[PDB]
Every structure is written in structure tokens, then in C-alpha cells.
Design a protein around this motif. Structure first.
Motif, PDB file in Angstrom:
ATOM      1  N   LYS A  11       0.832  -1.293  -0.106  1.00  0.00           N
ATOM      2  CA  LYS A  11      -0.092  -0.018  -0.005  1.00  0.00           C
ATOM      3  C   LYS A  11       0.768   1.293   0.112  1.00  0.00           C
ATOM      4  CE  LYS A  11      -3.931  -2.037   2.486  1.00  0.00           C
ATOM      5  NZ  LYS A  11      -5.119  -1.775   3.192  1.00  0.00           N
ATOM      6  N   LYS A  12       0.288   2.245  -0.737  1.00  0.00           N
ATOM      7  CA  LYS A  12       1.014   3.668  -1.135  1.00  0.00           C
ATOM      8  C   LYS A  12       1.920   3.401  -1.872  1.00  0.00           C
ATOM      9  CE  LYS A  12       1.093   6.592   3.028  1.00  0.00           C
ATOM     10  NZ  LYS A  12       2.134   7.652   3.229  1.00  0.00           N
ATOM     11  N   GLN A  13       2.442   2.435  -2.636  1.00  0.00           N
ATOM     12  CA  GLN A  13       3.378   2.333  -3.886  1.00  0.00           C
ATOM     13  C   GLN A  13       2.756   2.493  -5.179  1.00  0.00           C
ATOM     14  OE1 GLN A  13       6.592   2.591  -3.634  1.00  0.00           O
ATOM     15  NE2 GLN A  13       7.497   1.414  -2.046  1.00  0.00           N
ATOM     16  N   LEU A  14       3.054   3.443  -6.037  1.00  0.00           N
ATOM     17  CA  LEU A  14       2.911   3.635  -7.292  1.00  0.00           C
ATOM     18  C   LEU A  14       4.233   3.357  -8.097  1.00  0.00           C
ATOM     19  CD1 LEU A  14       1.279   3.850  -9.646  1.00  0.00           C
ATOM     20  CD2 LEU A  14       0.527   6.318  -9.125  1.00  0.00           C
ATOM     21  N   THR A  15       4.302   2.388  -8.878  1.00  0.00           N
ATOM     22  CA  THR A  15       5.098   2.266  -9.816  1.00  0.00           C
ATOM     23  C   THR A  15       4.820   2.192 -11.296  1.00  0.00           C
ATOM     24  OG1 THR A  15       6.154   0.510  -8.110  1.00  0.00           O
ATOM     25  CG2 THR A  15       7.111   0.446 -10.335  1.00  0.00           C
ATOM     26  N   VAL A  16       5.828   2.949 -12.275  1.00  0.00           N
ATOM     27  CA  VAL A  16       5.693   3.076 -13.386  1.00  0.00           C
ATOM     28  C   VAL A  16       6.717   1.814 -14.047  1.00  0.00           C
ATOM     29  CG1 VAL A  16       5.849   4.229 -15.482  1.00  0.00           C
ATOM     30  CG2 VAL A  16       5.066   5.358 -13.404  1.00  0.00           C
ATOM     31  N   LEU A  17       6.151   0.718 -14.660  1.00  0.00           N
ATOM     32  CA  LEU A  17       6.805  -0.186 -15.049  1.00  0.00           C
ATOM     33  C   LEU A  17       7.119  -0.048 -16.432  1.00  0.00           C
ATOM     34  CD1 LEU A  17       6.275  -3.914 -13.619  1.00  0.00           C
ATOM     35  CD2 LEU A  17       8.374  -2.352 -13.312  1.00  0.00           C
ATOM     36  N   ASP A  18       8.352   0.420 -16.831  1.00  0.00           N
ATOM     37  CA  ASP A  18       8.965   0.685 -18.044  1.00  0.00           C
ATOM     38  C   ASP A  18       9.924  -0.157 -18.257  1.00  0.00           C
ATOM     39  OD1 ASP A  18      10.571   2.323 -16.072  1.00  0.00           O
ATOM     40  OD2 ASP A  18      10.941   3.747 -17.678  1.00  0.00           O
ATOM     41  N   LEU A  19       9.863  -0.908 -19.465  1.00  0.00           N
ATOM     42  CA  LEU A  19       8.947  -0.466 -20.549  1.00  0.00           C
ATOM     43  C   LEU A  19       7.701  -1.512 -20.542  1.00  0.00           C
ATOM     44  CD1 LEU A  19      12.084  -0.049 -21.558  1.00  0.00           C
ATOM     45  CD2 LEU A  19      10.862   1.124 -23.434  1.00  0.00           C
TER      46      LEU A  19
END
Length: 430
Positions: A11-19
Motif C-alpha cells: 500500500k502507498k506504492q505507485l510504480t511505473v513499470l517501463d517498458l
């Protein structure tokens, strides 16, 4: 970042998984089930949803596209629609958005709702995309080297001066700014002896299958193919242009341009090729530069219309995902509708198949879904044309009248099928 770790599920984690679809998504799903996290997976299109079903076979996923699953999978648009309607939607502990660069209003709103939920401390999210909201890199890495060339690309029928277009013996995906533009180039190509498939937002879900089932030389596509469409191609031709819906004087929507694409769009278009590690030298031919044409783009104002109408917590209105939040000027909560007008708003968008902005104007004006009087009582300069004469419809009363909507949104008549759909609407046929 570049690799998934189980800690991203907190919880509280936002990850941009690129690519991705890979065994990566199944990995995430396995980790989520092991942790008993109620999870949504959000696919941009049904085409991608079906691809996902394949990869996730054997895993307990409920496909909303045992009877007992804790992982749900649906389209971006479906998630946001369910949020807006009275329907109970779980407060998912984990939100996975595939092709999270999608600039459809429903997708932007979903990013906003999801990112707000993680900020509140209630959930985790993973946004999967090669081109994060905000990117300035039109030439991101690829699985195999791409030959990038800046060249004048035809935007109209041509006969001389573009031999490189037709001399090619492989398969080309060609991005155009509009359906009508694609129609002209497609006709030119077909006259030249090529086999052409055309794709657009309204036809994609059913016509994309032709790229698997039929022989083809060129796919002519609008920007819908930026969302994970997989072709077995060796060249992309990119006009580098798009149309931009723009709200003028808060009173009308025009389709501005064609104008430059964003770096994300260019990167996605190019990313249709260079995908096979055993096939270097795919070609990307591009016909203009990039620009920040998402600034002041109607989709981000429409996103606010949607999000203003989604409940989150007493007194709270979800903000857009921060990297996208300056693309619109609006006061948070300015588009919040009361329960009955909200219901009208939703019906105009779903059953009505009206653009968000237009649906809002009608609903906020206190007009009920079935009352189509507004389609005919606009100013003269709102008359919609068909074959360069005013378009006419028989009203549900049987009276033939000129289509002249009170609020003009160019998306309602930008091509033949759009006009056909709106005429049926004005006639009371849905």
C-alpha cells in the motif's frame, strides 16, 4: 522501474513499470494471489484483454470483458464506467494498468482515481507503459535496432516523388491523423496494387483480426494502434500528426490540426517495430517533429468531468495523476453533477455514445436522455453537413429537420460513421 519486485505491491506504492504480458504479468498475479490482494488488471482494449487471458490461463482471474476469484480483469473504460454508475466496485488493494499511457478520457480518469487511492494510503498500483505520462523521448530502446529516417510523408493521394513508399516489399504500419485521411491514402495504395487494412477506434476491436487472417501490405491506422496492437511488420510510416479536440470558448469542440504528435505517441508508433531480437533493421520513417499537443487537449478536461462524478470519500474529489495534471485548466469539482443529472450524463455517454464533453453539456442543462429537441435548435452555424448540404433526419415525431445541435462537438460528424451514429441519435433511435 525496469524490473518488478514484490515490494511494489505494498500500500502507498505507485510504480511505473517501463517498458509485460509475458510471464511478467503472470508473475505479478501469482504474487498478488499469494498475498491475498484483491486485484484489478486494466487492459486498454478487448484485443489486449484476450491476449491477457492467454497468458493468465490456469490462474484464477475473473474476466469482466470457480465463481470465486480475487483478481478481476477488465478494460480501462469498463473500470471507470463502473465507478460512475451505482455499481459496487471493490476498493482494490492492487491496481495494474496495462498500456498506461492511453489518453482516452476514461483512461486518464482511471489513472487519477487509482493514483489518488494510493496517495490516501489505501492501495498500490503498477502502471505498465513504455512511455510514461510526461516523456520527452521519441526514440526509446527497442529489442532490436531500428533505422530512423526523417522524410516527407504523403498525407494526400500521390503519383510521383514518393517511390520509397511503394517500392518496399514487406509489411508497413502507417499512422495517420484521421479516418478520412487514412481513407485517401488507403485508396491511393490500393490503386497502386497494395493490399490495405484500415483501423480506427470504432473498428479496431473487430478489424484488427484481419491483420492475422488476411494477407496485407499496409495497415493504415489512427492512433488507436498505439495501445499495444502487435503487428508482424518491418516498417512504420509515421505522419507524426494527429487531430486535437479543443474546446473553444467553453461552447464548442473543434478538431484542430492536423498537428504534431507527443513524444509518447511517436515513441509508441515507432514501437510497433524493432520488436524481434532476431530481425534488426526494421524501418521508422517519420514526417514531422513532436510537440506537447496534449496541453489544452479536450481529453484531459473530459477526464475531469468523469472524475468529478466518481465517489471516493466524503468531500473528496480525485486529482489527475500528477504528471498529467497540468494538461487541463479546471477547478476540481466544477463538473460534479447531482444524482439524476449524473445518471443522464452516464447514459448519454454509454447508450448515447456521445463524446464526454457533449454528454456533459446536455446533462448539466437538465435535459433527459430521450429528449432530443436540442439536436435541432442550435444556431445556424451549428448545422451539420452531409455531402456539402445540410444533414437531415426524421425526428421521432416523423418530421424531417436539419441537424443543428445546440452544442456542436466536431467528433459527432468527423467521418461517415460518426455522422451516421449521431443522426440515429437525433432521430431517437437509441
Amino acid at each position: 522501474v525496469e524490473c518488478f519486485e514484490p515490494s511494489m505491491l505494498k500500500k502507498k506504492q505507485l510504480t511505473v513499470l517501463d517498458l509485460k504480458t509475458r510471464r511478467v504479468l503472470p508473475e505479478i498475479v501469482r504474487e498478488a494471489i499469494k498475498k491475498r490482494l484483491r486485484t484489478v488488471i486494466l487492459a486498454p482494449t478487448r484485443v489486449v484483454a484476450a491476449e491477457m487471458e492467454e497468458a493468465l490461463r490456469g490462474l484464477p482471474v475473473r474476466y469482466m470483458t470457480s465463481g470465486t476469484e480475487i483478481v478481476d480483469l477488465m478494460c480501462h473504460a469498463t473500470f471507470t464506467s463502473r465507478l460512475l454508475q451505482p455499481i459496487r466496485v471493490p476498493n482494490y488493494n492492487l491496481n495494474i494498468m496495462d498500456e498506461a499511457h492511453f489518453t482516452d478520457p476514461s483512461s486518464i480518469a482511471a489513472r487519477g482515481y487509482i493514483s489518488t487511492r494510493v496517495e490516501m494510503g489505501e492501495a498500490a498500483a503498477i502502471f505498465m507503459t513504455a512511455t510514461p505520462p510526461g516523456t520527452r523521448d521519441a526514440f526509446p530502446d527497442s529489442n532490436s535496432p531500428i533505422m530512423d529516417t526523417e522524410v516527407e510523408v504523403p498525407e494526400r493521394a500521390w503519383s510521383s516523388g514518393f517511390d520509397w513508399v511503394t517500392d518496399h516489399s514487406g509489411k508497413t504500419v502507417w499512422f495517420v491523423p484521421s479516418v478520412r485521411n487514412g481513407n485517401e491514402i488507403a485508396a491511393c495504395l490500393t490503386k497502386a496494387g497494395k493490399r490495405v487494412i484500415q483501423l480506427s477506434r470504432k473498428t479496431f476491436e473487430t478489424e484488427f483480426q484481419k491483420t492475422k487472417n488476411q494477407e496485407w501490405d499496409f495497415v493504415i491506422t489512427t492512433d488507436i494502434s498505439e495501445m499495444g496492437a502487435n503487428f508482424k511488420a518491418d516498417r512504420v510510416i509515421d505522419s507524426r500528426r494527429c487531430l486535437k479536440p479543443v474546446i473553444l470558448d467553453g461552447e464548442r469542440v473543434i478538431l484542430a490540426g492536423p498537428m504534431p504528435v507527443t513524444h509518447a505517441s511517436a515513441a509508441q508508433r515507432r514501437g510497433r517495430i524493432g520488436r524481434n531480437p532476431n530481425k534488426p533493421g526494421d524501418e521508422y520513417m517519420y514526417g514531422g517533429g513532436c510537440a506537447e499537443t496534449d496541453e489544452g487537449h479536450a481529453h484531459w478536461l473530459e477526464a475531469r468531468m468523469l472524475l468529478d462524478n466518481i465517489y471516493l470519500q466524503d468531500g473528496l474529489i480525485a486529482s489527475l495523476y500528477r504528471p498529467e495534471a497540468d494538461k487541463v485548466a479546471a477547478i476540481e469539482g466544477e463538473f460534479k453533477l447531482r444524482t439524476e443529472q449524473r445518471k443522464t450524463f452516464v447514459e448519454l455517454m454509454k447508450r448515447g455514445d456521445l463524446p464526454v464533453w457533449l454528454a456533459y453539456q446536455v446533462a448539466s442543462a437538465g435535459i433527459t436522455y430521450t429528449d432530443r429537441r436540442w439536436c435541432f435548435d442550435g444556431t445556424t452555424n451549428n448545422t451539420i453537413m452531409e455531402d456539402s448540404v445540410p444533414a437531415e433526419v426524421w425526428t421521432k415525431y416523423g418530421e424531417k429537420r436539419v441537424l443543428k445541435p445546440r452544442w456542436m462537438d466536431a467528433r459527432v460528424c468527423s467521418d461517415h460513421a460518426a455522422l451516421k451514429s449521431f443522426k440515429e441519435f437525433a432521430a431517437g433511435k437509441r
